[PDB]
Amino acid sequence: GPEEITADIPNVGEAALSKLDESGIVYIGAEVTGGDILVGKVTPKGETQLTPEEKLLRAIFGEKASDVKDSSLRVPNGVSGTVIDVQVFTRDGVEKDKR
Amino acid sequence: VTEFLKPRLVDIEQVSSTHAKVTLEPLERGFGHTLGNALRRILLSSMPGCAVTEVEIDGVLHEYSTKEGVQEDILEILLNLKGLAVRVQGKDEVILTLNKSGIGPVTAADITHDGDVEIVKPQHVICHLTDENASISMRIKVQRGRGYVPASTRIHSEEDERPIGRLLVDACYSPVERIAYNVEAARVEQRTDLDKLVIEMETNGTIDPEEAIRRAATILAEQLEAFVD
Amino acid sequence: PGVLKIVKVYLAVKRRIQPGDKMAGRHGNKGVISKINPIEDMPYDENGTP
């Protein structure tokens, strides 16, 4: 499955998602510190059987199912500061244009 | 002591609104230089003045983006304003707000200058708007401080604070930052020939010069005695 | 073909001199930023210009 940017990073802290805008990428204008995650791509993961323990987990937690691996863009170590700009080039056949 | 002839300040001159020159009665040699040194230190570095700590604009965030019409950007506006200084009362953490509409020259009259936010140099090059539809309104928190520091220092105190839009601003904070102490041999006729001291102090308006002289020499006495133990 | 889309983000970080800066002079004379004391330590001119 395609890896798309929607800030739906599995096992993601709120403050981490509290920077990225809806399209996984974030908005424009403030700073960033440390290894802050910028764009949240989600790598598709393989499926499994009915998996009674995992079924119980989904009934308890759910919304993950070990299906989306966090492929998010994060700031580099020792890299922090203000942001100049962002640009998205989408191939023909994909017209997300979420932001 | 032995006829110490403790002198007093005399003929303290103030040429302009942003400096002063204080003359003094004569004193001894081998000490006047050291005394002037200590005075300049305590007046310039540990100097209670005012600067800008926070900045903001609804359309202008931390990123260095030029405001509509305004020729200078956020960093550039910070630079152009930095060429001046602002006033807060005995209370610190005052706020000035430079807001203007039209296309005429940008100056400090259309800026928040209060009874606890005071302006003296009101015609700086402030990147006047060039588009008629523009109406600029930037707000700079002007507080009071003493010593030089960067902006990353306030990251810990403003982490859940300083959200996307609030600009945290730094300063170099030496509210005197210039004071010359000159010891010469004059103003002594009856007793031993003595050295009189002149202080050419200068500020950006943050504080009074003779006030800085009193503060610095009070610190001079204070740390001077501390050698007793 | 591999990527459906790409999102390139560029962040500009400032930088001032520090312990370890390298200045140069057009007379080919260069130098390492070594020690900066308080501005008081600078020798004072006759007019005191440090």
mmCIF file with all atom_site columns, N, CA and C in Angstrom, chain A residues 5-72:
data_model
loop_
_atom_site.group_PDB
_atom_site.id
_atom_site.type_symbol
_atom_site.label_atom_id
_atom_site.label_alt_id
_atom_site.label_comp_id
_atom_site.label_asym_id
_atom_site.label_entity_id
_atom_site.label_seq_id
_atom_site.pdbx_PDB_ins_code
_atom_site.Cartn_x
_atom_site.Cartn_y
_atom_site.Cartn_z
_atom_site.occupancy
_atom_site.B_iso_or_equiv
_atom_site.pdbx_formal_charge
_atom_site.auth_seq_id
_atom_site.auth_comp_id
_atom_site.auth_asym_id
_atom_site.auth_atom_id
_atom_site.pdbx_PDB_model_num
ATOM 1   N N  . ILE A 1 5  ? 0.828   10.936  3.661  1.00 0.00 ? 5  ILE A N  1
ATOM 2   C CA . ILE A 1 5  ? 1.128   11.859  4.744  1.00 0.00 ? 5  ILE A CA 1
ATOM 3   C C  . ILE A 1 5  ? -0.194  12.390  5.281  1.00 0.00 ? 5  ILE A C  1
ATOM 4   N N  . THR A 1 6  ? -0.540  11.983  6.500  1.00 0.00 ? 6  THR A N  1
ATOM 5   C CA . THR A 1 6  ? -1.764  12.443  7.134  1.00 0.00 ? 6  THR A CA 1
ATOM 6   C C  . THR A 1 6  ? -1.639  12.648  8.638  1.00 0.00 ? 6  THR A C  1
ATOM 7   N N  . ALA A 1 7  ? -0.426  12.632  9.194  1.00 0.00 ? 7  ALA A N  1
ATOM 8   C CA . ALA A 1 7  ? -0.179  12.782  10.628 1.00 0.00 ? 7  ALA A CA 1
ATOM 9   C C  . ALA A 1 7  ? -0.798  11.656  11.448 1.00 0.00 ? 7  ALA A C  1
ATOM 10  N N  . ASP A 1 8  ? -1.113  10.528  10.810 1.00 0.00 ? 8  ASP A N  1
ATOM 11  C CA . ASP A 1 8  ? -1.626  9.359   11.519 1.00 0.00 ? 8  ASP A CA 1
ATOM 12  C C  . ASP A 1 8  ? -0.486  8.376   11.771 1.00 0.00 ? 8  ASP A C  1
ATOM 13  N N  . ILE A 1 9  ? 0.493   8.851   12.533 1.00 0.00 ? 9  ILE A N  1
ATOM 14  C CA . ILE A 1 9  ? 1.678   8.067   12.861 1.00 0.00 ? 9  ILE A CA 1
ATOM 15  C C  . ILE A 1 9  ? 1.286   7.076   13.950 1.00 0.00 ? 9  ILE A C  1
ATOM 16  N N  . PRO A 1 10 ? 1.440   5.776   13.731 1.00 0.00 ? 10 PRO A N  1
ATOM 17  C CA . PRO A 1 10 ? 1.175   4.828   14.813 1.00 0.00 ? 10 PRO A CA 1
ATOM 18  C C  . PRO A 1 10 ? 2.112   5.080   15.979 1.00 0.00 ? 10 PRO A C  1
ATOM 19  N N  . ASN A 1 11 ? 1.562   4.950   17.185 1.00 0.00 ? 11 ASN A N  1
ATOM 20  C CA . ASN A 1 11 ? 2.300   5.189   18.424 1.00 0.00 ? 11 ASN A CA 1
ATOM 21  C C  . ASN A 1 11 ? 2.968   6.563   18.399 1.00 0.00 ? 11 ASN A C  1
ATOM 22  N N  . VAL A 1 12 ? 2.134   7.597   18.310 1.00 0.00 ? 12 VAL A N  1
ATOM 23  C CA . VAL A 1 12 ? 2.624   8.961   18.187 1.00 0.00 ? 12 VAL A CA 1
ATOM 24  C C  . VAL A 1 12 ? 2.113   9.768   19.366 1.00 0.00 ? 12 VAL A C  1
ATOM 25  N N  . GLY A 1 13 ? 3.035   10.452  20.038 1.00 0.00 ? 13 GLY A N  1
ATOM 26  C CA . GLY A 1 13 ? 2.650   11.358  21.089 1.00 0.00 ? 13 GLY A CA 1
ATOM 27  C C  . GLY A 1 13 ? 1.914   12.566  20.548 1.00 0.00 ? 13 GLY A C  1
ATOM 28  N N  . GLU A 1 14 ? 1.070   13.138  21.407 1.00 0.00 ? 14 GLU A N  1
ATOM 29  C CA . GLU A 1 14 ? 0.214   14.237  20.984 1.00 0.00 ? 14 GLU A CA 1
ATOM 30  C C  . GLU A 1 14 ? 1.021   15.454  20.562 1.00 0.00 ? 14 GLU A C  1
ATOM 31  N N  . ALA A 1 15 ? 2.052   15.809  21.330 1.00 0.00 ? 15 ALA A N  1
ATOM 32  C CA . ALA A 1 15 ? 2.866   16.967  20.978 1.00 0.00 ? 15 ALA A CA 1
ATOM 33  C C  . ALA A 1 15 ? 3.532   16.775  19.624 1.00 0.00 ? 15 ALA A C  1
ATOM 34  N N  . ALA A 1 16 ? 3.896   15.532  19.296 1.00 0.00 ? 16 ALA A N  1
ATOM 35  C CA . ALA A 1 16 ? 4.451   15.252  17.979 1.00 0.00 ? 16 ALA A CA 1
ATOM 36  C C  . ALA A 1 16 ? 3.441   15.557  16.884 1.00 0.00 ? 16 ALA A C  1
ATOM 37  N N  . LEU A 1 17 ? 2.228   15.027  17.013 1.00 0.00 ? 17 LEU A N  1
ATOM 38  C CA . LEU A 1 17 ? 1.169   15.372  16.077 1.00 0.00 ? 17 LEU A CA 1
ATOM 39  C C  . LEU A 1 17 ? 0.729   16.820  16.216 1.00 0.00 ? 17 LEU A C  1
ATOM 40  N N  . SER A 1 18 ? 1.041   17.463  17.336 1.00 0.00 ? 18 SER A N  1
ATOM 41  C CA . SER A 1 18 ? 0.686   18.855  17.590 1.00 0.00 ? 18 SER A CA 1
ATOM 42  C C  . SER A 1 18 ? 1.525   19.816  16.822 1.00 0.00 ? 18 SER A C  1
ATOM 43  N N  . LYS A 1 19 ? 2.271   19.379  15.814 1.00 0.00 ? 19 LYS A N  1
ATOM 44  C CA . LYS A 1 19 ? 3.017   20.317  14.991 1.00 0.00 ? 19 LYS A CA 1
ATOM 45  C C  . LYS A 1 19 ? 2.621   20.135  13.536 1.00 0.00 ? 19 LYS A C  1
ATOM 46  N N  . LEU A 1 20 ? 2.520   18.884  13.116 1.00 0.00 ? 20 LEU A N  1
ATOM 47  C CA . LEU A 1 20 ? 2.115   18.582  11.759 1.00 0.00 ? 20 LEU A CA 1
ATOM 48  C C  . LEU A 1 20 ? 0.677   19.018  11.528 1.00 0.00 ? 20 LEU A C  1
ATOM 49  N N  . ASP A 1 21 ? 0.440   19.621  10.367 1.00 0.00 ? 21 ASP A N  1
ATOM 50  C CA . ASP A 1 21 ? -0.898  19.983  9.945  1.00 0.00 ? 21 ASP A CA 1
ATOM 51  C C  . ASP A 1 21 ? -1.576  18.727  9.398  1.00 0.00 ? 21 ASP A C  1
ATOM 52  N N  . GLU A 1 22 ? -2.780  18.895  8.852  1.00 0.00 ? 22 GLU A N  1
ATOM 53  C CA . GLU A 1 22 ? -3.641  17.748  8.583  1.00 0.00 ? 22 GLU A CA 1
ATOM 54  C C  . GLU A 1 22 ? -3.021  16.796  7.566  1.00 0.00 ? 22 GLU A C  1
ATOM 55  N N  . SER A 1 23 ? -2.347  17.336  6.556  1.00 0.00 ? 23 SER A N  1
ATOM 56  C CA . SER A 1 23 ? -1.781  16.516  5.494  1.00 0.00 ? 23 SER A CA 1
ATOM 57  C C  . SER A 1 23 ? -0.481  15.841  5.903  1.00 0.00 ? 23 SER A C  1
ATOM 58  N N  . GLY A 1 24 ? -0.261  15.631  7.200  1.00 0.00 ? 24 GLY A N  1
ATOM 59  C CA . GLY A 1 24 ? 0.976   15.033  7.653  1.00 0.00 ? 24 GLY A CA 1
ATOM 60  C C  . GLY A 1 24 ? 2.083   16.057  7.740  1.00 0.00 ? 24 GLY A C  1
ATOM 61  N N  . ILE A 1 25 ? 2.199   16.902  6.722  1.00 0.00 ? 25 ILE A N  1
ATOM 62  C CA . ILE A 1 25 ? 3.099   18.044  6.784  1.00 0.00 ? 25 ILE A CA 1
ATOM 63  C C  . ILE A 1 25 ? 2.521   19.049  7.766  1.00 0.00 ? 25 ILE A C  1
ATOM 64  N N  . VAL A 1 26 ? 3.323   20.037  8.149  1.00 0.00 ? 26 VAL A N  1
ATOM 65  C CA . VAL A 1 26 ? 2.905   21.039  9.120  1.00 0.00 ? 26 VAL A CA 1
ATOM 66  C C  . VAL A 1 26 ? 2.642   22.354  8.408  1.00 0.00 ? 26 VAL A C  1
ATOM 67  N N  . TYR A 1 27 ? 2.235   23.359  9.172  1.00 0.00 ? 27 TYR A N  1
ATOM 68  C CA . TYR A 1 27 ? 2.020   24.695  8.648  1.00 0.00 ? 27 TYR A CA 1
ATOM 69  C C  . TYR A 1 27 ? 3.352   25.431  8.523  1.00 0.00 ? 27 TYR A C  1
ATOM 70  N N  . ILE A 1 28 ? 3.268   26.746  8.341  1.00 0.00 ? 28 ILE A N  1
ATOM 71  C CA . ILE A 1 28 ? 4.430   27.572  8.037  1.00 0.00 ? 28 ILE A CA 1
ATOM 72  C C  . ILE A 1 28 ? 4.527   28.735  9.016  1.00 0.00 ? 28 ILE A C  1
ATOM 73  N N  . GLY A 1 29 ? 5.699   28.957  9.612  1.00 0.00 ? 29 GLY A N  1
ATOM 74  C CA . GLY A 1 29 ? 5.950   30.214  10.298 1.00 0.00 ? 29 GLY A CA 1
ATOM 75  C C  . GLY A 1 29 ? 6.659   30.242  11.642 1.00 0.00 ? 29 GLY A C  1
ATOM 76  N N  . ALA A 1 30 ? 6.559   29.183  12.441 1.00 0.00 ? 30 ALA A N  1
ATOM 77  C CA . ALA A 1 30 ? 7.242   29.150  13.730 1.00 0.00 ? 30 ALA A CA 1
ATOM 78  C C  . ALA A 1 30 ? 8.554   28.375  13.586 1.00 0.00 ? 30 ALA A C  1
ATOM 79  N N  . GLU A 1 31 ? 9.130   27.952  14.706 1.00 0.00 ? 31 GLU A N  1
ATOM 80  C CA . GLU A 1 31 ? 10.398  27.245  14.735 1.00 0.00 ? 31 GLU A CA 1
ATOM 81  C C  . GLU A 1 31 ? 10.169  25.760  14.983 1.00 0.00 ? 31 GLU A C  1
ATOM 82  N N  . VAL A 1 32 ? 11.276  25.029  15.082 1.00 0.00 ? 32 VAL A N  1
ATOM 83  C CA . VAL A 1 32 ? 11.243  23.602  15.366 1.00 0.00 ? 32 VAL A CA 1
ATOM 84  C C  . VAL A 1 32 ? 12.502  23.268  16.147 1.00 0.00 ? 32 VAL A C  1
ATOM 85  N N  . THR A 1 33 ? 12.357  22.401  17.142 1.00 0.00 ? 33 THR A N  1
ATOM 86  C CA . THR A 1 33 ? 13.461  22.081  18.028 1.00 0.00 ? 33 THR A CA 1
ATOM 87  C C  . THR A 1 33 ? 13.691  20.578  18.038 1.00 0.00 ? 33 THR A C  1
ATOM 88  N N  . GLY A 1 34 ? 14.951  20.199  18.217 1.00 0.00 ? 34 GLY A N  1
ATOM 89  C CA . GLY A 1 34 ? 15.294  18.793  18.334 1.00 0.00 ? 34 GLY A CA 1
ATOM 90  C C  . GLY A 1 34 ? 14.963  18.035  17.068 1.00 0.00 ? 34 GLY A C  1
ATOM 91  N N  . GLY A 1 35 ? 14.543  16.789  17.245 1.00 0.00 ? 35 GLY A N  1
ATOM 92  C CA . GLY A 1 35 ? 14.223  15.916  16.133 1.00 0.00 ? 35 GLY A CA 1
ATOM 93  C C  . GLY A 1 35 ? 12.746  15.889  15.812 1.00 0.00 ? 35 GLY A C  1
ATOM 94  N N  . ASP A 1 36 ? 12.129  17.067  15.801 1.00 0.00 ? 36 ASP A N  1
ATOM 95  C CA . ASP A 1 36 ? 10.692  17.193  15.609 1.00 0.00 ? 36 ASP A CA 1
ATOM 96  C C  . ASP A 1 36 ? 10.228  16.560  14.299 1.00 0.00 ? 36 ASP A C  1
ATOM 97  N N  . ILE A 1 37 ? 9.128   15.812  14.385 1.00 0.00 ? 37 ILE A N  1
ATOM 98  C CA . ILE A 1 37 ? 8.585   15.136  13.214 1.00 0.00 ? 37 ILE A CA 1
ATOM 99  C C  . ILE A 1 37 ? 7.797   16.122  12.366 1.00 0.00 ? 37 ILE A C  1
ATOM 100 N N  . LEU A 1 38 ? 8.147   16.200  11.083 1.00 0.00 ? 38 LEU A N  1
ATOM 101 C CA . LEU A 1 38 ? 7.594   17.191  10.168 1.00 0.00 ? 38 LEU A CA 1
ATOM 102 C C  . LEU A 1 38 ? 6.430   16.681  9.342  1.00 0.00 ? 38 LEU A C  1
ATOM 103 N N  . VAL A 1 39 ? 6.626   15.618  8.568  1.00 0.00 ? 39 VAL A N  1
ATOM 104 C CA . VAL A 1 39 ? 5.589   15.065  7.706  1.00 0.00 ? 39 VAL A CA 1
ATOM 105 C C  . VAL A 1 39 ? 5.387   13.618  8.111  1.00 0.00 ? 39 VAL A C  1
ATOM 106 N N  . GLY A 1 40 ? 4.139   13.235  8.357  1.00 0.00 ? 40 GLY A N  1
ATOM 107 C CA . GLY A 1 40 ? 3.854   11.879  8.778  1.00 0.00 ? 40 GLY A CA 1
ATOM 108 C C  . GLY A 1 40 ? 3.383   10.955  7.677  1.00 0.00 ? 40 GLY A C  1
ATOM 109 N N  . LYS A 1 41 ? 4.304   10.238  7.043  1.00 0.00 ? 41 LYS A N  1
ATOM 110 C CA . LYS A 1 41 ? 3.947   9.225   6.066  1.00 0.00 ? 41 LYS A CA 1
ATOM 111 C C  . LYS A 1 41 ? 3.688   7.920   6.803  1.00 0.00 ? 41 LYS A C  1
ATOM 112 N N  . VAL A 1 42 ? 2.767   7.125   6.278  1.00 0.00 ? 42 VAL A N  1
ATOM 113 C CA . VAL A 1 42 ? 2.425   5.858   6.907  1.00 0.00 ? 42 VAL A CA 1
ATOM 114 C C  . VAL A 1 42 ? 2.703   4.740   5.919  1.00 0.00 ? 42 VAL A C  1
ATOM 115 N N  . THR A 1 43 ? 3.711   3.957   6.220  1.00 0.00 ? 43 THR A N  1
ATOM 116 C CA . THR A 1 43 ? 4.081   2.823   5.394  1.00 0.00 ? 43 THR A CA 1
ATOM 117 C C  . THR A 1 43 ? 3.064   1.715   5.573  1.00 0.00 ? 43 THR A C  1
ATOM 118 N N  . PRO A 1 44 ? 2.510   1.173   4.497  1.00 0.00 ? 44 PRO A N  1
ATOM 119 C CA . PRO A 1 44 ? 1.586   0.047   4.653  1.00 0.00 ? 44 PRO A CA 1
ATOM 120 C C  . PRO A 1 44 ? 2.293   -1.160  5.244  1.00 0.00 ? 44 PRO A C  1
ATOM 121 N N  . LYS A 1 45 ? 1.547   -1.906  6.052  1.00 0.00 ? 45 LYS A N  1
ATOM 122 C CA . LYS A 1 45 ? 2.042   -3.111  6.698  1.00 0.00 ? 45 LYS A CA 1
ATOM 123 C C  . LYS A 1 45 ? 1.156   -4.299  6.341  1.00 0.00 ? 45 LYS A C  1
ATOM 124 N N  . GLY A 1 46 ? 1.730   -5.498  6.427  1.00 0.00 ? 46 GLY A N  1
ATOM 125 C CA . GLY A 1 46 ? 1.002   -6.692  6.053  1.00 0.00 ? 46 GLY A CA 1
ATOM 126 C C  . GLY A 1 46 ? -0.084  -7.053  7.051  1.00 0.00 ? 46 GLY A C  1
ATOM 127 N N  . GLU A 1 47 ? -1.096  -7.762  6.555  1.00 0.00 ? 47 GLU A N  1
ATOM 128 C CA . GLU A 1 47 ? -2.215  -8.187  7.382  1.00 0.00 ? 47 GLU A CA 1
ATOM 129 C C  . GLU A 1 47 ? -1.951  -9.559  7.998  1.00 0.00 ? 47 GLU A C  1
ATOM 130 N N  . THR A 1 48 ? -2.838  -9.950  8.912  1.00 0.00 ? 48 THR A N  1
ATOM 131 C CA . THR A 1 48 ? -2.712  -11.216 9.627  1.00 0.00 ? 48 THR A CA 1
ATOM 132 C C  . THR A 1 48 ? -4.037  -11.965 9.669  1.00 0.00 ? 48 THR A C  1
ATOM 133 N N  . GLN A 1 49 ? -4.101  -13.019 10.483 1.00 0.00 ? 49 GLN A N  1
ATOM 134 C CA . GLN A 1 49 ? -5.327  -13.793 10.643 1.00 0.00 ? 49 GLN A CA 1
ATOM 135 C C  . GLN A 1 49 ? -6.274  -13.111 11.625 1.00 0.00 ? 49 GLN A C  1
ATOM 136 N N  . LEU A 1 50 ? -7.331  -13.815 12.040 1.00 0.00 ? 50 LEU A N  1
ATOM 137 C CA . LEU A 1 50 ? -8.278  -13.248 12.995 1.00 0.00 ? 50 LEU A CA 1
ATOM 138 C C  . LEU A 1 50 ? -7.585  -12.844 14.294 1.00 0.00 ? 50 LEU A C  1
ATOM 139 N N  . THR A 1 51 ? -6.504  -13.539 14.647 1.00 0.00 ? 51 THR A N  1
ATOM 140 C CA . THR A 1 51 ? -5.564  -13.120 15.682 1.00 0.00 ? 51 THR A CA 1
ATOM 141 C C  . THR A 1 51 ? -6.265  -12.779 16.990 1.00 0.00 ? 51 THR A C  1
ATOM 142 N N  . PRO A 1 52 ? -6.732  -13.783 17.741 1.00 0.00 ? 52 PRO A N  1
ATOM 143 C CA . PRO A 1 52 ? -7.595  -13.492 18.898 1.00 0.00 ? 52 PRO A CA 1
ATOM 144 C C  . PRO A 1 52 ? -6.992  -12.526 19.904 1.00 0.00 ? 52 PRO A C  1
ATOM 145 N N  . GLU A 1 53 ? -5.691  -12.618 20.174 1.00 0.00 ? 53 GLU A N  1
ATOM 146 C CA . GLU A 1 53 ? -5.064  -11.637 21.055 1.00 0.00 ? 53 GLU A CA 1
ATOM 147 C C  . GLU A 1 53 ? -5.046  -10.259 20.404 1.00 0.00 ? 53 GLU A C  1
ATOM 148 N N  . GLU A 1 54 ? -4.673  -10.195 19.125 1.00 0.00 ? 54 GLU A N  1
ATOM 149 C CA . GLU A 1 54 ? -4.700  -8.922  18.415 1.00 0.00 ? 54 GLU A CA 1
ATOM 150 C C  . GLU A 1 54 ? -6.129  -8.435  18.223 1.00 0.00 ? 54 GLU A C  1
ATOM 151 N N  . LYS A 1 55 ? -7.076  -9.361  18.041 1.00 0.00 ? 55 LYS A N  1
ATOM 152 C CA . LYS A 1 55 ? -8.478  -8.963  17.979 1.00 0.00 ? 55 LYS A CA 1
ATOM 153 C C  . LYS A 1 55 ? -8.920  -8.330  19.293 1.00 0.00 ? 55 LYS A C  1
ATOM 154 N N  . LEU A 1 56 ? -8.497  -8.910  20.419 1.00 0.00 ? 56 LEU A N  1
ATOM 155 C CA . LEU A 1 56 ? -8.807  -8.329  21.720 1.00 0.00 ? 56 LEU A CA 1
ATOM 156 C C  . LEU A 1 56 ? -8.158  -6.962  21.878 1.00 0.00 ? 56 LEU A C  1
ATOM 157 N N  . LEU A 1 57 ? -6.924  -6.815  21.394 1.00 0.00 ? 57 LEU A N  1
ATOM 158 C CA . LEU A 1 57 ? -6.263  -5.515  21.453 1.00 0.00 ? 57 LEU A CA 1
ATOM 159 C C  . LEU A 1 57 ? -7.011  -4.477  20.625 1.00 0.00 ? 57 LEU A C  1
ATOM 160 N N  . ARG A 1 58 ? -7.452  -4.860  19.428 1.00 0.00 ? 58 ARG A N  1
ATOM 161 C CA . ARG A 1 58 ? -8.207  -3.942  18.582 1.00 0.00 ? 58 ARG A CA 1
ATOM 162 C C  . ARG A 1 58 ? -9.534  -3.570  19.227 1.00 0.00 ? 58 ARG A C  1
ATOM 163 N N  . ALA A 1 59 ? -10.195 -4.541  19.861 1.00 0.00 ? 59 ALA A N  1
ATOM 164 C CA . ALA A 1 59 ? -11.399 -4.234  20.617 1.00 0.00 ? 59 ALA A CA 1
ATOM 165 C C  . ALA A 1 59 ? -11.086 -3.361  21.826 1.00 0.00 ? 59 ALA A C  1
ATOM 166 N N  . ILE A 1 60 ? -9.846  -3.404  22.313 1.00 0.00 ? 60 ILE A N  1
ATOM 167 C CA . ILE A 1 60 ? -9.451  -2.587  23.454 1.00 0.00 ? 60 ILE A CA 1
ATOM 168 C C  . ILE A 1 60 ? -8.854  -1.268  22.983 1.00 0.00 ? 60 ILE A C  1
ATOM 169 N N  . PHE A 1 61 ? -7.790  -1.345  22.185 1.00 0.00 ? 61 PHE A N  1
ATOM 170 C CA . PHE A 1 61 ? -7.210  -0.152  21.582 1.00 0.00 ? 61 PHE A CA 1
ATOM 171 C C  . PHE A 1 61 ? -7.762  0.093   20.182 1.00 0.00 ? 61 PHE A C  1
ATOM 172 N N  . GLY A 1 62 ? -7.377  -0.743  19.220 1.00 0.00 ? 62 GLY A N  1
ATOM 173 C CA . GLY A 1 62 ? -7.847  -0.607  17.858 1.00 0.00 ? 62 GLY A CA 1
ATOM 174 C C  . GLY A 1 62 ? -7.300  0.630   17.178 1.00 0.00 ? 62 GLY A C  1
ATOM 175 N N  . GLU A 1 63 ? -7.774  0.837   15.947 1.00 0.00 ? 63 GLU A N  1
ATOM 176 C CA . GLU A 1 63 ? -7.421  1.980   15.114 1.00 0.00 ? 63 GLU A CA 1
ATOM 177 C C  . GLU A 1 63 ? -5.974  1.894   14.634 1.00 0.00 ? 63 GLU A C  1
ATOM 178 N N  . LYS A 1 64 ? -5.288  0.804   14.991 1.00 0.00 ? 64 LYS A N  1
ATOM 179 C CA . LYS A 1 64 ? -3.924  0.539   14.552 1.00 0.00 ? 64 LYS A CA 1
ATOM 180 C C  . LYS A 1 64 ? -3.822  -0.768  13.779 1.00 0.00 ? 64 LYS A C  1
ATOM 181 N N  . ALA A 1 65 ? -4.086  -1.895  14.442 1.00 0.00 ? 65 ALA A N  1
ATOM 182 C CA . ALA A 1 65 ? -4.089  -3.223  13.829 1.00 0.00 ? 65 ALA A CA 1
ATOM 183 C C  . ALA A 1 65 ? -2.733  -3.590  13.229 1.00 0.00 ? 65 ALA A C  1
ATOM 184 N N  . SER A 1 66 ? -1.678  -2.890  13.651 1.00 0.00 ? 66 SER A N  1
ATOM 185 C CA . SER A 1 66 ? -0.327  -3.089  13.125 1.00 0.00 ? 66 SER A CA 1
ATOM 186 C C  . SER A 1 66 ? -0.320  -2.983  11.602 1.00 0.00 ? 66 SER A C  1
ATOM 187 N N  . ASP A 1 67 ? -1.099  -2.039  11.077 1.00 0.00 ? 67 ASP A N  1
ATOM 188 C CA . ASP A 1 67 ? -1.249  -1.882  9.636  1.00 0.00 ? 67 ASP A CA 1
ATOM 189 C C  . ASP A 1 67 ? -0.492  -0.682  9.084  1.00 0.00 ? 67 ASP A C  1
ATOM 190 N N  . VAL A 1 68 ? -0.265  0.342   9.900  1.00 0.00 ? 68 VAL A N  1
ATOM 191 C CA . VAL A 1 68 ? 0.431   1.547   9.475  1.00 0.00 ? 68 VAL A CA 1
ATOM 192 C C  . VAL A 1 68 ? 1.722   1.669   10.268 1.00 0.00 ? 68 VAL A C  1
ATOM 193 N N  . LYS A 1 69 ? 2.847   1.514   9.582  1.00 0.00 ? 69 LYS A N  1
ATOM 194 C CA . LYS A 1 69 ? 4.158   1.722   10.170 1.00 0.00 ? 69 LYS A CA 1
ATOM 195 C C  . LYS A 1 69 ? 4.497   3.197   10.062 1.00 0.00 ? 69 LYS A C  1
ATOM 196 N N  . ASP A 1 70 ? 4.997   3.770   11.154 1.00 0.00 ? 70 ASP A N  1
ATOM 197 C CA . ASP A 1 70 ? 5.314   5.191   11.143 1.00 0.00 ? 70 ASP A CA 1
ATOM 198 C C  . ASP A 1 70 ? 6.471   5.476   10.194 1.00 0.00 ? 70 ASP A C  1
ATOM 199 N N  . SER A 1 71 ? 6.176   6.114   9.065  1.00 0.00 ? 71 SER A N  1
ATOM 200 C CA . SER A 1 71 ? 7.176   6.528   8.087  1.00 0.00 ? 71 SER A CA 1
ATOM 201 C C  . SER A 1 71 ? 7.279   8.042   8.072  1.00 0.00 ? 71 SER A C  1
ATOM 202 N N  . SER A 1 72 ? 7.131   8.647   9.247  1.00 0.00 ? 72 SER A N  1
ATOM 203 C CA . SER A 1 72 ? 7.032   10.092  9.347  1.00 0.00 ? 72 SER A CA 1
ATOM 204 C C  . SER A 1 72 ? 8.377   10.762  9.111  1.00 0.00 ? 72 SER A C  1
#
